[PDB]
Amino acid sequence: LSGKTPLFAGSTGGLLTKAVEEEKYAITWTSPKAQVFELPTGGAATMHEGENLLYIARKEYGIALGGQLRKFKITNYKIYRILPSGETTFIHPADGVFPEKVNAGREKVRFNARSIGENPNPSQVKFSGKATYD
């Protein structure tokens, strides 16, 4: 992970003890212009001219921030998951294409070929460990 931290004085809302112990997140993006943007949790900050990086508590804050970056026309937002051992994984886009646009490499999962009304009654699957939706 390489990038400049946005310039902000600091805030009570932000990283907490969970970050050291459990899966802190980090978002990365490149800017064309230095602009003022609202942080995910309180306040405002100034992004640098290129290769910004911000450490984040939850994945929801990063994607919520990405929607704000799209207002500034920045679509190269990347999110990572940082475990305490330092393992960093390219978490949000697994492949370069975004989730909205289809790609051949992906595969359907948890697809129920039946209609929703065709689900079985729960009495038929009691005392079996099965669930109706499965």
Partner 1 sequence: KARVIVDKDPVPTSFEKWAQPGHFDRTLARGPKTTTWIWNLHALAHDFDTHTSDLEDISRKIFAAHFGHLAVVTIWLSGMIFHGAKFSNYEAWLSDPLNVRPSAQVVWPIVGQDILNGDVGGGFHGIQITSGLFQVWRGWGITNSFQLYCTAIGGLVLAGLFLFAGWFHYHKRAPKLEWFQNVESMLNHHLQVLLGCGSLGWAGHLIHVSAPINKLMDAGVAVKDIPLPHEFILNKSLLIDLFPGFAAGLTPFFTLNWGQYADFLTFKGGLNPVTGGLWMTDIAHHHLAIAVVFIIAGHQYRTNWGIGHSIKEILENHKGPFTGEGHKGLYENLTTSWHAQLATNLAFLGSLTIIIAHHMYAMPPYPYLATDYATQLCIFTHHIWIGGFLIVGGAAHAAIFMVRDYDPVVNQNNVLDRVIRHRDAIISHLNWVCIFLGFHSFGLYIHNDTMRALGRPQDMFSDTAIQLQPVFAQWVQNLHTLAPGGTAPNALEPVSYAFGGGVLAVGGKVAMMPIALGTADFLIHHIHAFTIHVTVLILLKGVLFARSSRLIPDKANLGFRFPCDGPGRGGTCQVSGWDHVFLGLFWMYNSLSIVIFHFSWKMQSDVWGTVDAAGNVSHITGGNFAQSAITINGWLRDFLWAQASQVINSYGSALSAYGLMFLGAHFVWAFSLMFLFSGRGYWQELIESIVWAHNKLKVAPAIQPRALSITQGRAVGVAHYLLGGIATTWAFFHAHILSV
Partner 2 sequence: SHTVKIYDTCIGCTQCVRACPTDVLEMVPWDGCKAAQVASSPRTEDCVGCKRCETACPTDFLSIRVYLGAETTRSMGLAY
Partner 3 sequence: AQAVDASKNLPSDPRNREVVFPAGRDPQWGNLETPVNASPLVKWFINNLPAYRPGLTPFRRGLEVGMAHGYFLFGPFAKLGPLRDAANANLAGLLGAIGLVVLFTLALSLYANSNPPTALASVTVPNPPDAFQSKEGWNNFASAFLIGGIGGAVVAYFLTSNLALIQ
Instruction: Tell me the two tokens of residue 75.
Output: 């679509």
Binding site for partner 3 (CB under 8 A): 5, 8-17, 54-56
Instruction: Tell me the two tokens of residue 2.
Output: 């390489």
Contact between 101 and partner 2 by CB under 8 A: the answer reads yes
CA gap 102, 33 in Å, rounded: 30
Residue 54 interacts, among partner 1, partner 3, partner 2, none and using kind-specific CB cut-offs from 5 to 8 Å, with partner 3
Report the relative pairing of strands 52-56 and 24-29 from DSSP bridges.
antiparallel
Residue 49 interacts, among partner 2, partner 3, partner 1, none and using kind-specific CB cut-offs from 5 to 8 Å, with none
Give 21's DSSP letter.
H
Q: Could you tell me the smallest distance in angstroms from the CB atom of residue 112 to partner 2? A: 5
CA gap 95, 43 in Å, rounded: 32
On whether the CB atoms of residues 56 and 62 are closer than 8 A, the answer is yes
Q: Could you tell me the smallest distance in angstroms from the CB atom of residue 61 to partner 1? A: 5
Nearer to partner 1, 11 or 89 (CB): 11
Which positions touch partner 2 (CB under 8 A)?
16-18, 22, 57-60, 63-64, 92, 94, 99-104, 106-117, 131, 133-134
